[PDB]
Amino acid sequence: PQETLNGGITDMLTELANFEKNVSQAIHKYNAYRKAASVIAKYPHKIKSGAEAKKLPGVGTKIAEKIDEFLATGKLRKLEKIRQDDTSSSINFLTRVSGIGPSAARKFVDEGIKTLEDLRKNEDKLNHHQRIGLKYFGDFEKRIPREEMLQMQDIVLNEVKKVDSEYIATVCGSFRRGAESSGDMDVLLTHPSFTSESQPKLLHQVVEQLQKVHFITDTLSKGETKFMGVCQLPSKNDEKEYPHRRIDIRLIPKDQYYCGVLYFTGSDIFNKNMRAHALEKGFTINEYTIRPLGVTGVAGEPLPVDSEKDIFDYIQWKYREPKDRSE
DNA sequence: CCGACATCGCATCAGC
DNA sequence: GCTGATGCGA
DNA sequence: GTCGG
Ligand SMILES: Nc1ccn([C@H]2C[C@H](O)[C@@H](COP(=O)(O)NP(=O)(O)OP(=O)(O)O)O2)c(=O)n1
Ligand SMILES: [Mg+2]
Ligand SMILES: [Mg+2]
Ligand code: NA
Ligand code: NA
């Protein structure tokens, strides 16, 4: 029930997580540190020893050692040192630009480019995605109040039906889990003339419409089944301008619609725990189709599903509402 | 001691 | 020209 | 880094 309880520790693991991801390029250590931080964050006691923390799932030998040091000194020497290392701190920060991953960030820092200022000086060395992530650096780190999400949802739902009233658009992600604020907007899309069976420009025409009314402002990537870009709420004539926001639109076949709603509603860790738990209950689920495993796991055919708890029963879990799907 | 920890679409690079 | 590998964010 | 084969 508390961030403050073991906050010194959970911050330590979060920092260590980011450096593995961005500097050491180890996505699973990043995931491992996060898991440890999470379960420790829900632990309703103030941890007194590393042996005490090791008891929790996700916490093992090394993190136990790290906790002992922190508790008996108040610092982590490995972390103190990596904090003050110019190269490692520069690589880490640069990855906060959308489009710049660990590879490119390491590349830029190697040739002397270490700040936003240096980036804004070297546009020739940037792909289109990166120029936009740089441009809207501040805004993309701002959270979106649910009030604005509802306003955003209004424009989207309106223009979708305006193109063709047989479309269905569902706003998923954290917004659908009911969160008070979101980091971006996720839009699920479907149309009767697109199933797992076979109208050519379904995604293009929705996007084209949203650009027409000046909702979508930039395009990070776009194809037949998926769009990633930037959007903006129009301002009140006297009042100031809104931040540019990240938006993703994806086109999913209608006959697989609900599995997509489940997945893109999330959450992140929740989907990992469902697909890790299907493999022990003789199932295997992705964003398209839950399939009943065979004996050695030979994957049967795509079942029917006409609501989200259909899936929860196949897998035999209690139907948790979206608001309870953080993990 | 050692591999799994999920897989996806799209931009861009490596190379025939 | 093309296919495939990689990086990236989800 | 953690878990389990
Ligand atoms: N790595 C990831 C990231 C997201 N997802 C699914 C669950 C996420 O809810 C859904 C959308 O990703 P997302 O926008 O990045 N996260 P989410 O919407 O949950 O929260 P926010 O960042 O928006 O606030 O993707 C996933 O399965 N694996
Ligand atoms: Mg979201
Ligand atoms: Mg998103
Ligand atoms: Na443990
Ligand atoms: Na980034």
Side-chain angles (χ1 to χ4, degrees), chain A residues 1 4-196 198 200 202-235 240-300 302-327:
Chain A
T4 272
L5 261 183
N6 301 284
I9 293 176
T10 45
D11 283 350
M12 172 178 97
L13 304 182
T14 305
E15 262 191 84
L16 286 170
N18 287 325
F19 285 110
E20 297 297 328
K21 176 175 160 55
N22 297 321
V23 190
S24 284
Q25 261 163 317
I27 189 65
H28 299 298
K29 287 202 199 174
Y30 160 80
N31 282 328
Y33 276 117
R34 269 167 81 241
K35 194 178 187 208
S38 197
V39 60
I40 287 175
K42 298 139 203 269
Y43 183 65
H45 299 274
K46 160 148 189 75
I47 286 176
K48 280 153 206 183
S49 73
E52 178 189 339
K54 190 165 185 302
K55 297 199 178 187
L56 311 181
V59 180
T61 297
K62 273 158 159 196
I63 295 178
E65 292 171 42
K66 297 211 162 70
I67 280 157
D68 290 326
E69 157 162 5
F70 180 89
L71 284 181
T73 62
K75 70 198 210 75
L76 202 70
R77 298 185 62 85
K78 275 190 194 211
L79 190 54
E80 289 297 334
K81 187 67 182 174
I82 205 159
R83 272 193 201 156
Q84 61 180 301
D85 189 26
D86 182 57
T87 306
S88 291
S89 44
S90 286
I91 293 173
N92 190 64
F93 167 75
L94 279 193
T95 62
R96 287 169 57 184
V97 181
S98 181
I100 292 174
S103 191
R106 179 168 294 270
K107 208 148 298 181
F108 288 134
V109 167
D110 271 330
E111 53 179 328
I113 296 160
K114 299 168 182 195
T115 67
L116 294 180
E117 297 79 337
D118 304 323
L119 284 179
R120 287 190 252 108
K121 281 182 199 173
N122 288 267
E123 248 207 354
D124 284 16
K125 289 145 174 299
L126 270 72
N127 64 39
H128 172 91
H129 187 149
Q130 288 159 352
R131 278 157 177 154
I132 303 199
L134 171 57
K135 186 190 207 261
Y136 303 119
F137 184 86
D139 287 354
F140 283 7
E141 289 206 334
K142 279 191 184 65
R143 299 201 63 74
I144 313 169
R146 202 193 155 80
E147 170 55 34
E148 284 183 32
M149 298 289 297
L150 286 174
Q151 284 194 284
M152 281 157 54
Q153 186 188 39
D154 285 353
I155 293 180
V156 173
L157 293 179
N158 196 42
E159 304 292 352
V160 156
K161 192 194 180 154
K162 257 173 73 170
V163 166
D164 188 301
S165 317
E166 296 187 341
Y167 285 121
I168 303 296
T170 316
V171 181
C172 301
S174 49
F175 172 85
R176 197 178 168 254
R177 302 200 308 273
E180 281 291 299
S181 85
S182 290
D184 59 32
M185 168 159 273
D186 289 85
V187 182
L188 211 73
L189 197 62
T190 199
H191 190 281
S193 77
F194 174 40
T195 49
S196 42
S198 40
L202 288 180
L203 192 52
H204 174 78
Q205 292 178 336
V206 170
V207 175
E208 184 180 358
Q209 181 55 27
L210 290 174
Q211 298 190 283
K212 201 164 101 86
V213 306
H214 299 116
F215 185 53
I216 293 176
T217 62
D218 301 84
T219 294
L220 302 177
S221 88
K222 166 184 159 56
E224 295 285 358
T225 58
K226 157 185 197 238
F227 164 92
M228 316 198 322
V230 198
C231 63
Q232 183 186 24
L233 286 170
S235 20
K240 98 174 201 68
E241 276 213 326
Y242 287 94
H244 287 69
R245 315 294 201 168
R246 279 278 291 107
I247 178 161
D248 296 336
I249 314 176
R250 243 204 178 96
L251 182 74
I252 174 169
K254 176 157 188 336
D255 68 285
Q256 306 178 325
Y257 174 87
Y258 296 118
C259 310
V261 182
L262 176 83
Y263 178 85
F264 290 100
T265 304
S267 95
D268 179 29
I269 268 57
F270 166 80
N271 288 349
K272 185 167 181 175
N273 290 335
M274 206 191 212
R275 85 180 87 106
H277 161 87
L279 167 145
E280 274 193 346
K281 246 162 207 200
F283 283 87
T284 177
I285 176 175
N286 48 61
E287 62 180 59
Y288 296 138
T289 47
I290 169 74
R291 315 190 306 258
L293 247 221
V295 198
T296 13
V298 128
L303 284 151
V305 134
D306 42 282
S307 50
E308 287 184 66
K309 124 139 194 173
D310 287 345
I311 305 176
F312 275 87
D313 292 304
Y314 285 114
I315 192 178
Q316 293 295 270
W317 261 357
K318 307 197 326 197
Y319 176 62
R320 286 130 52 76
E321 296 298 327
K323 53 175 261 182
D324 302 349
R325 285 186 215 162
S326 54
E327 328 178 289

